[PDB]
């Protein structure tokens, strides 16, 4: 159909900066902003 | 003015009245209105007591 | 001295800061310390920015620090940190055991001093009351200024200042030396930012404030004093240090603290410099926005003539479909715009509404 | 110790819980006549570090933005031959210390890399050997 091919990439897309997602962006070494 | 001015319900309006000069009567300021539901509710518990 | 960076929104202050510090960094690596001073919600942000570069990727001799972090900083060398802390709720359940023993001697809230959330109401009212400088004996000054006085409004009223008086200066009496109080530390950094030198020859830059309550004004003075050199940045349209803006105008806050400021400044006799920002640094790309800014306050307000691309107001049928909609716009700008995650941002003036369903 | 604990920077029991000896005995050590006669010395000294993603967590493989890793080195101090680390750990030793130091060092051994690490990226100069010592019988490591 008119959007076969759409339909198709967008069900099969992913997150190119995905696995970096889940990283917490501060990381203390020894504030709520941080992880351990 | 239009967003500080008085325009609403009656209840609206009695809830400002209340939150303003809850120290008159005994009324606890943070008090939370019960929905016709849980209201009932109570109502039940306390009648079969 | 000190330098007020001013200009409206989205001018560039907050990068230009940043590239300051960096600039500072790359020059003497082990300078005298660098000071951000931020609101507590922004002190990640800076943090992420600074560290950003291709030449250092990080900072030593700049720090980012809200009037919190500060405080604990130049505390746990000043002292006054292994002084027990006690908890808002801690302070009410001092509160209750107040409540009752001076119950009797209230003239208006003895009737509201059982419920229960008259402790969190009047713990409220305290913290306000340091932040403002205003201590027991003060409240009980102007207690006595409204009584004997006839408008019915003004008497109640002293009645209260009365009441929160007596609990006011029975609460210090049973803090006095032996208890820490959360808004405390801010009035203990500011009387021992003196003798704490390695602020001494320190550049200092403040950011993201609208506002200072008189107890973080208290801090800001007197950095100001000690301080080799001190810059504020607010966002502001040419403000004035001769007058206080009028009620209606769209920097009140920002232009209210300037002057003040300014005033303050000028009574210390410092060195003052000053840098407007005129041209749009953040929307040099992006007209409309541009103009949403430009022509925010203005009741003569010209009507935008061009294209539809960047705004868009949009209606749901309901908080999940507008949530639900918006999920798919951002997929729309990450998969096709080429956006990522950490461009999007979502406000709302409640978030309480959204919270639980976002 | 008096001092702080008038200034209240140690509690009652803090106070009476140090052990002068193993304060003084550090200056007593190379390290610590060193620390003394140098042109330039700080302490608790507070850094962030913009890293790869990748330089800690090695699980994930693909995306390499910088996170920040934040921490403060207890003591750096220079000399005319060049920059030192100075590290202070209460770790418990006796209970010889030559056996306990190869695990000593690779307790604290990721850590102290981290430290330089800030330093020599940062500062852009470059810190040539880091000393750690121990409250535990007054002992010395470098790395």
Same mark, same amino acid.
Request: include cysteine.
């Given at each position: 159909?008119?959007?076969?091919?759409?339909?198709?990439?967008?069900?099969?897309?992913?997150?190119?900066?995905?696995?970096?997602?889940?990283?917490?962006?501060?990381?203390?070494?020894?504030?709520?902003?941080?992880?351990? | 003015?239009?967003?500080?001015?008085? #325009?609403?319900?009656?209840?609206?309006?009695?809830?400002?009245?209340?939150?303003?000069?809850?120290?008159?009567?005994?009324?606890?300021?943070?008090?939370?209105?019960?929905?016709?539901?849980?209201?009932?509710?109570?109502?039940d518990?306390?009648?079969?007591? | 001295?000190?330098?007020?960076?001013?200009?409206?929104?989205?001018?560039?202050?907050?990068?230009?800061?940043?590239?300051?510090?960096?600039?500072?960094?790359?020059?003497?690596?082990?300078?005298?310390?660098? #000071?951000?001073?931020?609101?507590?919600?922004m002190?990640?942000?800076?943090?992420?920015?600074?560290?950003?570069?291709?030449?250092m990727?990080?900072?030593?001799?700049?720090?980012?620090?809200?009037?919190?972090?500060?405080?604990?900083?130049?505390?746990?060398?000043?002292?006054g940190?292994?002084?027990?802390?006690?908890?808002?709720?801690?302070?009410?359940?001092?509160?209750?055991?107040?409540?009752?023993?001076?119950?009797?001697?209230?003239?208006?809230?003895?009737?509201?001093?059982?419920?229960?959330?008259?402790?969190?109401?009047?713990?409220?009212?305290?913290?306000?009351?340091?932040?403002?400088?205003?201590?027991?004996?003060?409240?009980?000054?102007?207690?006595?200024?409204?009584?004997?006085?006839?408008?019915?409004?003004?008497?109640?009223?002293?009645?209260?200042?009365?009441?929160?008086?007596?609990?006011?200066?029975?609460?210090?009496?049973?803090?006095?030396?032996?208890?820490?109080?959360?808004?405390?530390?801010?009035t203990?950094?500011?009387?021992?930012?003196?003798?704490?030198?390695?602020?001494?020859?320190?550049?200092?830059?403040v950011?993201?404030?609208?506002?200072?309550?008189?107890?973080?004004?208290?801090?800001?003075?007197?950095?100001?004093?000690?301080?080799?050199h001190?810059?504020?940045?607010?966002?502001?349209?040419?403000?004035?240090?001769?007058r206080?803006?009028?009620?209606?105008?769209?920097?009140?806050?920002?232009?209210?603290?300037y002057?003040?400021?300014?005033?303050?400044?000028?009574?210390?006799?410092?060195?003052?410099?000053?840098?407007?920002?005129?041209?749009?640094?953040?929307?040099?790309?992006?007209?409309?926005?541009?103009?949403?800014?430009?022509?925010?306050?203005?009741?003569?307000?010209?009507?935008?003539?061009?294209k539809?691309?960047?705004?868009?107001?949009?209606?749901?049928?309901?908080?999940?479909?507008?949530?639900?909609?918006?999920?798919?716009?951002?997929?729309?700008?990450?998969?096709?715009?080429?956006?990522?995650?950490?461009?999007?941002?979502?406000?709302?003036?409640?978030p309480?509404d959204?919270?639980?369903?976002? | 110790?008096?001092?702080?604990?008038?200034?209240?920077?140690?509690?009652?029991?803090?106070?009476?819980?140090?052990? #002068?000896?193993?304060?003084?005995?550090?200056?007593?050590?190379?390290?610590?006549?060193?620390?003394?006669?140098?042109?330039?010395?700080?302490?608790?000294?507070?850094?962030?570090?913009?890293?790869?993603?990748?330089?800690?967590?090695?699980?994930?493989?693909?995306?390499?933005?910088?996170?920040?890793?934040?921490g403060?080195?207890?003591?750096?101090?220079?000399?005319?031959?060049?920059?030192?680390?100075?590290?202070?750990?209460?770790?418990?030793?006796?209970?010889?210390?030559?056996?306990?130091?190869?695990?000593?060092?690779?307790?604290?051994?990721?850590?102290?890399?981290?430290?330089?690490?800030?330093?020599?990226q940062?500062?852009?100069?470059?810190?040539?050997?880091?000393?750690?010592?121990?409250?535990?019988?007054?002992?010395?490591?470098?790395?």
């Amino acid at each position: 159909f008119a959007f076969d091919e759409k339909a198709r990439e967008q069900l099969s897309w992913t997150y190119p900066h995905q696995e970096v997602t889940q990283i917490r962006t501060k990381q203390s070494v020894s504030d709520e902003y941080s992880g351990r | 003015l239009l967003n500080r001015a008085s #325009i609403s319900t009656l209840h609206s309006f009695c809830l400002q009245v209340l939150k303003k000069y809850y120290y008159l009567i005994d009324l606890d300021p943070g008090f939370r209105i019960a929905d016709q539901t849980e209201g009932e509710l109570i109502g039940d518990e306390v009648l079969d007591e | 001295g000190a330098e007020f960076l001013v200009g409206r929104s989205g001018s560039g202050k907050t990068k230009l800061i940043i590239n300051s510090i960096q600039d500072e960094l790359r020059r003497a690596p082990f300078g005298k310390p660098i #000071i951000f001073l931020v609101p507590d919600q922004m002190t990640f942000l800076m943090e992420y920015e600074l560290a950003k570069t291709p030449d250092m990727g990080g900072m030593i001799r700049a720090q980012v620090f809200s009037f919190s972090r500060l405080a604990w900083r130049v505390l746990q060398h000043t002292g006054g940190m292994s002084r027990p802390f006690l908890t808002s709720t801690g302070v009410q359940m001092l509160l209750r055991k107040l409540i009752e023993e001076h119950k009797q001697e209230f003239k208006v809230y003895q009737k509201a001093s059982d419920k229960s959330g008259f402790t969190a109401q009047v713990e409220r009212m305290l913290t306000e009351f340091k932040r403002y400088c205003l201590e027991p004996e003060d409240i009980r000054r102007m207690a006595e200024s409204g009584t004997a006085s006839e408008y019915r409004g003004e008497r109640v009223l002293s009645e209260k200042l009365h009441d929160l008086s007596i609990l006011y200066q029975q609460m210090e009496k049973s803090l006095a030396d032996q208890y820490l109080h959360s808004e405390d530390y801010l009035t203990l950094l500011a009387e021992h930012i003196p003798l704490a030198e390695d602020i001494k020859g320190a550049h200092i830059y403040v950011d993201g404030f609208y506002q200072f309550t008189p107890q973080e004004f208290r801090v800001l003075e007197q950095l100001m004093v000690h301080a080799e050199h001190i810059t504020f940045s607010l966002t502001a349209d040419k403000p004035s240090y001769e007058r206080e803006p009028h009620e209606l105008e769209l920097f009140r806050m920002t232009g209210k603290t300037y002057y003040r400021l300014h005033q303050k400044a000028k009574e210390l006799n410092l060195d003052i410099t000053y840098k407007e920002l005129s041209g749009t640094e953040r929307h040099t790309k992006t007209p409309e926005l541009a103009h949403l800014e430009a022509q925010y306050e203005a009741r003569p307000a010209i009507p935008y003539a061009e294209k539809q691309e960047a705004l868009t107001v949009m209606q749901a049928a309901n908080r999940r479909a507008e949530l639900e909609g918006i999920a798919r716009e951002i997929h729309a700008l990450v998969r096709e715009k080429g956006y990522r995650y950490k461009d999007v941002a979502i406000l709302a003036r409640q978030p309480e509404d959204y919270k639980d369903m976002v | 110790v008096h001092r702080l604990y008038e200034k209240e920077l140690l509690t009652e029991e803090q106070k009476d819980a140090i052990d #002068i000896e193993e304060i003084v005995q550090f200056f007593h050590t190379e390290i610590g006549g060193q620390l003394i006669g140098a042109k330039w010395k700080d302490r608790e000294i507070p850094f962030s570090l913009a890293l790869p993603a990748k330089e800690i967590y090695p699980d994930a493989h693909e995306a390499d933005e910088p996170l920040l890793v934040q921490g403060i080195i207890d003591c750096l101090y220079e000399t005319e031959d060049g920059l030192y680390l100075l590290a202070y750990k209460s770790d418990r030793i006796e209970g010889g210390f030559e056996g306990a130091a190869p695990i000593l060092k690779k307790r604290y051994e990721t850590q102290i890399q981290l430290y330089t690490k800030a330093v020599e990226q940062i500062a852009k100069t470059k810190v040539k050997g880091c000393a750690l010592y121990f409250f535990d019988g007054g002992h010395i490591l470098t790395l």
